[PDB]
Amino acid sequence: QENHHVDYVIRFNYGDIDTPEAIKKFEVLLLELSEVGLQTEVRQGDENSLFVFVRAASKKKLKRAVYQSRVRDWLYGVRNTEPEPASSAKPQSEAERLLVIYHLITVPKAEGGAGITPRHGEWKNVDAIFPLHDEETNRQCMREWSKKTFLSTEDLDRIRNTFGEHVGFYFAFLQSYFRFLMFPAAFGFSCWLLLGSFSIIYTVVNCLWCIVFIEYWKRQEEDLSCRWQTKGVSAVHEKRAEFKPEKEIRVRGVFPATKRMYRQLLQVPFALLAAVALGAIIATCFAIEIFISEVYNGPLKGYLVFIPTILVSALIPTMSAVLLTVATKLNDYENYETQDAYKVALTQKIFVVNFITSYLPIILTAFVYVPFASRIVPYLDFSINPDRLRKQVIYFTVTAQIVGFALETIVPFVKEDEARFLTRVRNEAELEDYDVTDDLREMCIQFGYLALFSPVWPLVPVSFLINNWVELRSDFFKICVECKRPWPQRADTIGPWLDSLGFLSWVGSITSSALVYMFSNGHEGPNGEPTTIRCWALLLTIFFSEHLYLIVRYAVRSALAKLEPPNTRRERIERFMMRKRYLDTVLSPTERFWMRQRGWKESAEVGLSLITKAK
Amino acid sequence: QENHHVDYVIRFNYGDIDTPEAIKKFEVLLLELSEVGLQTEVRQGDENSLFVFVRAASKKKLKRAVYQSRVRDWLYGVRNTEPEPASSAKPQSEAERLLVIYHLITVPKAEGGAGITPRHGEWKNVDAIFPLHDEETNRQCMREWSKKTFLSTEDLDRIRNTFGEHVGFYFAFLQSYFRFLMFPAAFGFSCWLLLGSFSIIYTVVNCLWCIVFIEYWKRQEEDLSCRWQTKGVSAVHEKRAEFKPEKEIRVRGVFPATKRMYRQLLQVPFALLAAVALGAIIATCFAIEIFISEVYNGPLKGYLVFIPTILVSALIPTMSAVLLTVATKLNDYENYETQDAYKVALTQKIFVVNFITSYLPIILTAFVYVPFASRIVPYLDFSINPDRLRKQVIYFTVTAQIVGFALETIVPFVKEDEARFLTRVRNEAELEDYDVTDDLREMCIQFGYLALFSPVWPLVPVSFLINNWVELRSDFFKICVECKRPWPQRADTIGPWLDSLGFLSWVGSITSSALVYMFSNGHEGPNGEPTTIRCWALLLTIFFSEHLYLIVRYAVRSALAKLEPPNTRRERIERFMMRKRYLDTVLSPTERFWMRQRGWKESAEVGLSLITKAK
Ligand SMILES: [Ca+2]
Ligand SMILES: [Ca+2]
Ligand SMILES: [Ca+2]
Ligand SMILES: [Ca+2]
């Protein structure tokens, strides 16, 4: 078997604990797991850690726990089909058994399982709860679709039966994104060949392609959550231990939704602190690099040009670690009963930083360096470089996808009987804690380049087509080789990223039509002076293109709503048929006016006597 | 009783039928009703009509039909609480008994009831199926809230238990609209007093008030449909007899959703035909009335000025009857399985005509007469009247609400034992066929004036506050006195009008900020020459105000989504508790690794031997 029927490993730390308090908490850790029906085996983890191997103590106690989990989904409307009895309740997959065991270890004792919250409040010494990789399943899948162009629907199901729906939704989204990139890649190679850059025809097909892909994925997510049975999964979301209720009414532990809305008002100050903090470092290091590159005409230019590129690589990550610390403090200040609401809210605070770090460099070039900078450089102490804007779009969409592939997958990888097994469990325990949000962020940031700036150099979607094929293979390699196996968390969507994709598509119709206008003479546009830009005509072309985007997006969203995908229709029918079974099994004076014409024949003849008489 | 226990009257016509074919169809009309469990009494209707009085033939056959109706709602997810057994199934109200009887008369014989479709395909002679007014309930309600400022929640429930949810939703919306108009009415009287017109402070509070009201009503509709148990009522919508299936699979009679989408493409040609047809008549009759009012300096001016006002009152209604005939032909061309989808689609085709007839006159004044018309009048063969734009907003928001009240309610009203009862049934049968869409249209068109043009003369929301109090009383009077009683149709929303209210609020943030800019010098603005309008600054003030509207609307819509109204929470809890009852009533080698430490105590001591040894 090579995994020894081990479900999870719980790593217990004692490096910061004295022996009387260490073994005091190790006892409760073991009897909490024993009480909820799990079997344990203790071994040496590290020089300072002692991890515990956990397994379902019996097929009867696991079938009952699997049954109780399906009953909880059905009661809350996630499943919609009756859960078949506990006598035949085998896990549908490995991801279902691993999710049922994970909930026994972590949900609080009033909810059914041991309340082992790793490292929060009483299990601070508990550092990790991780499952073990199925190495041969991981290696057969890796070689099997390094020879294909697309992963089958069954290949995508194999990813969720191993890693769960949250990881499976990312790969389903990335595959659908890659399949849609074939159109602008083929169209973007035509327009780059026949036409040039800043083409009117390219910019319209590109904005129309971004509308169709986002609307197609919003509908494909609903179909996919109905197929995987995670459709309303937010109703059974796991509470987070750090929550602080105000009252406690049954018991639930309520915190008012309006009180949290006042604290959420602080995100407006935070979003402006980040744009003043990051924007000042990006704009200042851009103005420097314009000076020593096009203004400073002295010696030392060979080895003085790397200053700005270096000074931003040591200042943007430093400031982003500061803003991520402020965002986490503000996220904690809001209370967030659930772990998903906490994670969704934190990802949304960080998107403000990602939008500025990722796109502000190109926005300064296209909209403050090209139109201006014959006005600026007299104060910066002109003949702007007409290829600065194109060489920067190439760097972010080609050299950043190639360089980023190296730091993402290669550098992390380069940095008696039970002795071989225990040796590799100690190796798995020192790998990384995979986060599918990091992958989703990188794909949605990449979508923003296509949406915002692809008219500059329409070969961008060819770079993304080639990159995204490799990305799907190397992201799967990264999960199987360089990260601990993620516990099979569920999801019905890629989350807050679907609204960022639509925000970037909207913003892209404004910046794309501003670029098609101010470069309609060439790629040099207004060579540094803003005189030849009719500000009214720049604004008219943005007003019409933005409202043509909004109108076409409403038409495309309303068409697709009329086309119910099949898995979504089957859950609507199945909710009807469930209620039919419940209904079949259980539930099984004036009157003188009406005494006139007794039957329907007398009415019939009273009508004949009047119909004929009236003619 | 005074209504003689009569549920419906079916008016049978024979003025265009010979006796052998008339009585041939009167027989089937009577035995179709007899078979579905109704009792009939025939009397003379008119000189050419013979209407049939219908009643539930027994309390056992009505309790069973009421029970089968509640079972159909529960099976399709409209109800969410189990339907209590047929033995105790009494109608909750008069509107529930009248709706259960109406479905017996009209739904097709394969669905349960007689297939009496008035005047469509075989019941062409059947001209009307109407219930009888409960005159004393109608008169007690009318006097009871002509003495109040607001109707209670119980008064609004009394309107739906009599007239159904579709009429009840209009009165609930009109009351909520009137209660919200107190703010801009009080604020609009402040700004008109202290400030003047075209105030920056008035225009921002007005656009912010339109956001809050629309978002508040979208949430109040969901709460109200959960309270009235019509939440997902579109799943049990009545099919329309005129539908034409392509296939027929079980049997359902399908027509492809994509085939209908191609025919719906013709609404783009229709919407442009109407804007070229109506716009040319409005713009031409406006240019005339500018000529003979400010340009023509000859005699006959006293009795030549009424030409344009007369020529548009005889041309706009004539053209609108033509476009309503084209819209109905295009609506029929699309197939529309349901009667609601047919009605919703027709209301949306007519909103294009309503938007142009209602607002284009003022839009021509504010945006082609004030900025231009010192350039136009040299070609029209200048010193524009600086009060033309204000006197026209006053006419549409004061004189049109007073004049319209007269044509709506006053002019339509001014234009042995069973002999007194039959005399008033013949009077009820000649009244009008009330349409709640006509009322909803008038309230949403009125909202558009507030949204679009109220900065001109901020006393507009005071006119609408006073008007809407009266409107609620006179619209109820009109239904009870001047129209046949509507059968108690159900609804979970005011329909397509909620998206027009949001479209008008969006457009109003563009025209309001354009008016605040070009009249920031006074109410005379640019006196006929467009020279002093900086076109870039007109466009910058529209770009920022429109995107501040969209941002504040997203923030307000996302806050309100976090605040689940109570009736909406009670249906979510009740779906859980229903499934709990269904679940309670029905549904009831490597192993050497784990043989090491049997209990949890042995693991506990193996951990002590390692914890101490490692320190
Ligand atoms: Ca990558
Ligand atoms: Ca990745
Ligand atoms: Ca009226
Ligand atoms: Ca009315």
Coordinates of C-alpha atoms in Angstrom, one line a residue, chain A residues 18-343:
Chain A
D18 CA 8.5 21.9 29.5
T19 CA 7.9 18.2 30.0
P20 CA 5.1 18.4 32.6
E21 CA 3.1 20.7 30.3
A22 CA 4.0 18.9 27.2
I23 CA 2.9 15.4 28.2
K24 CA -0.1 17.1 30.0
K25 CA -1.3 18.2 26.5
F26 CA -0.2 15.1 24.7
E27 CA -2.5 13.0 26.8
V28 CA -5.6 15.2 26.0
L29 CA -4.6 15.1 22.3
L30 CA -4.7 11.3 22.3
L31 CA -7.9 10.8 24.3
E32 CA -9.7 13.5 22.3
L33 CA -8.8 11.5 19.1
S34 CA -9.7 8.2 20.8
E35 CA -13.1 9.5 21.9
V36 CA -14.1 10.6 18.4
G37 CA -13.4 7.2 17.0
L38 CA -9.9 7.4 15.5
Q39 CA -6.8 5.1 16.0
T40 CA -3.4 6.5 16.7
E41 CA 0.2 5.6 16.5
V42 CA 2.9 7.9 17.9
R43 CA 6.4 8.2 16.4
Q44 CA 9.3 10.6 16.5
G45 CA 8.8 13.6 14.1
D46 CA 11.9 15.8 14.4
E47 CA 14.5 16.8 16.9
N48 CA 11.7 18.7 18.6
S49 CA 8.4 17.3 17.2
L50 CA 6.5 14.1 17.8
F51 CA 3.8 13.5 15.2
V52 CA 0.8 11.3 15.6
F53 CA -0.6 9.0 12.9
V54 CA -4.4 8.9 12.7
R55 CA -6.8 6.4 11.1
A56 CA -10.4 5.4 11.3
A57 CA -10.6 3.0 14.2
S58 CA -13.2 0.7 12.4
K59 CA -15.2 0.4 9.3
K60 CA -18.3 0.7 11.4
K61 CA -17.2 4.0 12.9
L62 CA -16.1 5.4 9.6
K63 CA -19.3 4.4 7.7
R64 CA -21.3 6.1 10.5
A65 CA -19.1 9.2 10.2
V66 CA -19.4 9.2 6.5
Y67 CA -23.2 8.8 6.8
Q68 CA -23.5 11.7 9.3
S69 CA -21.6 13.9 6.9
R70 CA -23.9 13.2 4.0
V71 CA -26.9 13.8 6.2
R72 CA -25.5 17.2 7.2
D73 CA -25.1 18.2 3.6
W74 CA -28.6 17.0 2.6
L75 CA -30.2 18.8 5.6
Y76 CA -28.6 22.1 4.6
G77 CA -29.5 21.7 0.9
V78 CA -26.1 21.0 -0.5
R79 CA -26.8 17.5 -1.7
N80 CA -30.5 17.4 -2.9
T81 CA -30.6 13.6 -3.0
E82 CA -31.5 11.5 0.0
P83 CA -28.4 10.0 1.7
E84 CA -28.4 6.3 1.4
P85 CA -28.3 4.4 4.7
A86 CA -25.3 4.0 7.0
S87 CA -25.1 0.3 6.3
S88 CA -23.8 0.9 2.8
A89 CA -22.0 4.2 3.4
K90 CA -18.6 3.8 1.8
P91 CA -16.6 7.0 0.8
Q92 CA -17.2 8.0 -2.8
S93 CA -13.5 8.8 -3.1
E94 CA -10.3 9.3 -1.2
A95 CA -11.1 13.0 -1.0
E96 CA -14.4 12.2 0.8
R97 CA -12.8 9.9 3.3
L98 CA -10.0 12.5 4.0
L99 CA -12.6 15.2 4.4
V100 CA -14.7 13.2 6.8
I101 CA -11.7 12.4 8.9
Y102 CA -10.4 16.0 8.9
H103 CA -13.8 17.2 10.3
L104 CA -13.6 14.6 13.1
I105 CA -10.2 16.0 14.1
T106 CA -11.0 19.7 13.9
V107 CA -14.7 20.6 14.5
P108 CA -15.4 21.5 18.1
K109 CA -16.6 18.9 20.6
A110 CA -20.1 20.4 20.7
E111 CA -20.3 19.8 17.0
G112 CA -19.2 16.2 16.9
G113 CA -15.4 16.0 16.6
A114 CA -12.3 16.7 18.7
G115 CA -11.7 20.4 18.8
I116 CA -8.0 20.3 17.7
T117 CA -7.5 23.7 16.2
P118 CA -3.8 23.7 15.1
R119 CA -1.8 26.4 16.9
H120 CA -4.7 28.7 17.9
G121 CA -5.7 28.6 21.5
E122 CA -5.1 25.3 23.3
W123 CA -3.5 23.3 20.5
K124 CA -0.8 25.9 19.9
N125 CA 1.8 23.1 20.0
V126 CA -0.1 21.2 17.3
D127 CA 1.7 22.7 14.2
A128 CA 0.2 20.8 11.2
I129 CA -2.5 18.3 10.3
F130 CA -1.7 16.9 6.8
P131 CA -2.6 13.9 4.7
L132 CA 0.0 11.8 2.9
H133 CA 0.6 12.0 -0.9
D134 CA -0.5 9.0 -3.0
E135 CA 2.8 9.0 -4.9
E136 CA 1.9 6.5 -7.7
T137 CA -1.5 8.1 -8.4
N138 CA 0.4 11.4 -8.5
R139 CA 3.0 10.1 -10.8
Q140 CA 0.6 8.3 -13.2
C141 CA -1.4 11.4 -13.6
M142 CA 1.7 13.6 -14.1
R143 CA 3.0 11.5 -17.0
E144 CA -0.4 10.7 -18.5
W145 CA -1.4 14.3 -19.4
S146 CA 2.1 15.6 -20.2
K147 CA 1.2 14.0 -23.5
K148 CA -2.2 15.7 -24.1
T149 CA -3.5 19.1 -25.1
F150 CA -6.5 19.0 -22.8
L151 CA -7.4 17.2 -19.7
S152 CA -10.6 15.1 -20.0
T153 CA -13.6 15.7 -17.8
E154 CA -12.5 12.5 -16.1
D155 CA -9.0 13.9 -15.5
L156 CA -10.5 16.9 -13.8
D157 CA -12.6 14.6 -11.7
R158 CA -9.5 12.7 -10.7
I159 CA -8.0 15.9 -9.4
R160 CA -11.0 16.6 -7.1
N161 CA -11.3 13.0 -5.9
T162 CA -7.7 13.3 -4.7
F163 CA -7.3 17.0 -3.7
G164 CA -11.0 18.1 -3.3
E165 CA -13.2 20.6 -5.0
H166 CA -11.2 23.8 -4.1
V167 CA -8.1 22.5 -5.9
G168 CA -10.3 21.0 -8.6
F169 CA -12.0 24.3 -9.3
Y170 CA -8.7 25.9 -10.0
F171 CA -7.6 23.3 -12.5
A172 CA -11.1 23.4 -14.1
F173 CA -10.8 27.2 -14.4
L174 CA -7.3 27.1 -15.7
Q175 CA -8.2 24.5 -18.3
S176 CA -11.2 26.5 -19.4
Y177 CA -9.1 29.6 -19.5
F178 CA -6.5 27.9 -21.6
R179 CA -9.1 26.6 -24.1
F180 CA -10.5 30.0 -24.5
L181 CA -7.1 31.6 -25.1
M182 CA -6.9 29.7 -28.4
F183 CA -9.2 32.3 -30.0
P184 CA -7.3 35.6 -29.1
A185 CA -4.1 33.7 -29.6
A186 CA -5.1 32.8 -33.1
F187 CA -6.7 36.2 -33.7
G188 CA -3.8 38.0 -32.0
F189 CA -1.4 36.4 -34.3
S190 CA -3.4 37.4 -37.3
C191 CA -3.7 41.1 -36.2
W192 CA 0.0 41.3 -35.3
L193 CA 0.8 40.0 -38.7
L194 CA -1.6 41.8 -41.0
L195 CA -2.4 44.8 -38.9
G196 CA 0.0 46.2 -36.3
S197 CA -0.4 47.3 -32.7
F198 CA -3.2 49.5 -31.3
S199 CA -5.6 48.1 -33.9
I200 CA -9.3 49.0 -33.6
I201 CA -10.3 45.5 -34.8
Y202 CA -8.1 43.7 -32.3
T203 CA -9.2 45.8 -29.3
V204 CA -12.9 45.1 -30.0
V205 CA -12.6 41.3 -30.4
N206 CA -10.4 41.3 -27.3
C207 CA -13.0 43.1 -25.1
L208 CA -15.7 40.9 -26.6
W209 CA -13.7 37.8 -25.8
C210 CA -13.2 38.9 -22.2
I211 CA -17.0 39.3 -21.8
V212 CA -17.7 35.9 -23.2
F213 CA -15.1 34.0 -21.2
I214 CA -16.2 35.6 -17.9
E215 CA -19.8 34.9 -18.6
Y216 CA -19.1 31.4 -19.8
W217 CA -17.1 30.6 -16.6
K218 CA -19.8 32.0 -14.3
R219 CA -22.2 29.5 -15.8
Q220 CA -19.6 26.7 -16.0
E221 CA -19.0 27.2 -12.2
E222 CA -22.7 26.6 -11.4
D223 CA -22.8 23.5 -13.6
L224 CA -19.6 22.2 -12.1
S225 CA -20.7 22.7 -8.5
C226 CA -23.9 20.8 -9.3
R227 CA -21.9 18.0 -10.8
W228 CA -19.6 17.8 -7.8
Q229 CA -22.4 18.3 -5.3
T230 CA -20.9 21.4 -3.7
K231 CA -23.5 23.9 -5.0
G232 CA -24.7 25.5 -1.8
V233 CA -21.6 24.5 0.2
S234 CA -21.4 27.9 2.0
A235 CA -24.2 26.8 4.2
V236 CA -22.0 24.1 5.9
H237 CA -18.8 26.2 6.1
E238 CA -16.5 25.4 8.9
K239 CA -16.5 28.0 11.7
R240 CA -13.1 29.5 12.6
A241 CA -11.9 29.1 16.2
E242 CA -10.8 32.8 16.5
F243 CA -14.4 34.0 16.2
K244 CA -15.7 36.1 19.1
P245 CA -19.5 36.2 19.6
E246 CA -21.2 39.0 21.4
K247 CA -24.3 37.1 22.6
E248 CA -24.8 33.4 22.6
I249 CA -28.3 32.3 21.6
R250 CA -29.5 28.8 20.7
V251 CA -26.3 27.6 20.9
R252 CA -24.9 29.8 18.1
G253 CA -22.7 32.6 19.4
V254 CA -24.0 35.6 17.4
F255 CA -22.2 38.7 16.3
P256 CA -24.3 41.4 14.7
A257 CA -23.9 41.8 10.9
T258 CA -24.2 45.6 11.2
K259 CA -21.5 45.9 13.9
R260 CA -19.1 44.1 11.5
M261 CA -20.0 46.5 8.7
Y262 CA -18.7 49.5 10.6
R263 CA -15.3 47.9 11.1
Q264 CA -15.3 47.0 7.4
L265 CA -15.4 50.7 6.7
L266 CA -11.7 50.8 7.6
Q267 CA -10.9 49.1 4.3
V268 CA -11.3 52.5 2.6
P269 CA -8.5 54.0 4.7
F270 CA -6.5 50.8 4.1
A271 CA -7.0 50.9 0.4
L272 CA -5.8 54.5 0.2
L273 CA -2.8 53.9 2.5
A274 CA -1.7 51.1 0.2
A275 CA -2.1 53.2 -3.0
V276 CA -0.2 56.1 -1.4
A277 CA 2.5 53.7 0.0
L278 CA 3.0 51.5 -3.0
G279 CA 2.2 54.2 -5.6
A280 CA 4.8 56.6 -4.3
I281 CA 7.5 53.9 -4.4
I282 CA 6.6 52.9 -7.9
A283 CA 6.2 56.4 -9.3
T284 CA 9.4 57.6 -7.6
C285 CA 11.5 54.7 -8.8
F286 CA 10.0 55.2 -12.3
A287 CA 11.0 58.8 -12.4
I288 CA 14.5 57.9 -11.3
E289 CA 14.8 55.3 -14.0
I290 CA 13.6 57.8 -16.6
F291 CA 16.2 60.3 -15.5
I292 CA 19.3 58.0 -15.5
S293 CA 18.1 56.3 -18.8
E294 CA 17.0 59.2 -21.0
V295 CA 18.0 62.4 -19.2
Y296 CA 21.4 61.8 -17.5
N297 CA 24.0 62.1 -20.2
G298 CA 27.1 61.4 -18.1
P299 CA 29.5 58.5 -17.4
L300 CA 28.8 55.4 -15.2
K301 CA 25.6 54.7 -17.2
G302 CA 26.5 51.1 -17.8
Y303 CA 26.5 50.3 -14.1
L304 CA 24.1 53.0 -12.8
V305 CA 21.0 51.8 -14.7
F306 CA 20.3 48.8 -12.4
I307 CA 19.7 51.0 -9.4
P308 CA 15.9 51.5 -9.9
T309 CA 15.1 47.9 -10.9
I310 CA 17.0 46.8 -7.8
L311 CA 15.6 49.4 -5.5
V312 CA 12.0 48.4 -6.3
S313 CA 12.7 44.7 -5.9
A314 CA 13.8 45.5 -2.4
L315 CA 11.1 48.0 -1.6
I316 CA 7.9 46.6 -3.2
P317 CA 8.2 43.2 -1.4
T318 CA 9.2 45.0 1.8
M319 CA 6.1 47.3 1.7
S320 CA 3.8 44.5 0.7
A321 CA 4.9 42.5 3.8
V322 CA 3.9 45.6 5.8
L323 CA 0.6 46.0 4.1
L324 CA -0.1 42.2 4.4
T325 CA 0.5 42.7 8.2
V326 CA -1.9 45.6 8.3
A327 CA -4.5 43.7 6.2
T328 CA -4.3 40.7 8.5
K329 CA -4.8 42.9 11.6
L330 CA -7.8 44.6 10.0
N331 CA -9.1 41.2 8.9
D332 CA -8.9 39.9 12.5
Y333 CA -10.6 43.0 13.8
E334 CA -13.6 42.1 11.7
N335 CA -14.9 38.9 13.3
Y336 CA -15.8 36.5 10.5
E337 CA -17.6 33.4 11.9
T338 CA -16.4 31.2 9.0
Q339 CA -12.9 30.4 7.7
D340 CA -14.0 31.0 4.1
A341 CA -15.4 34.5 4.9
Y342 CA -12.1 35.2 6.6
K343 CA -10.1 34.0 3.6

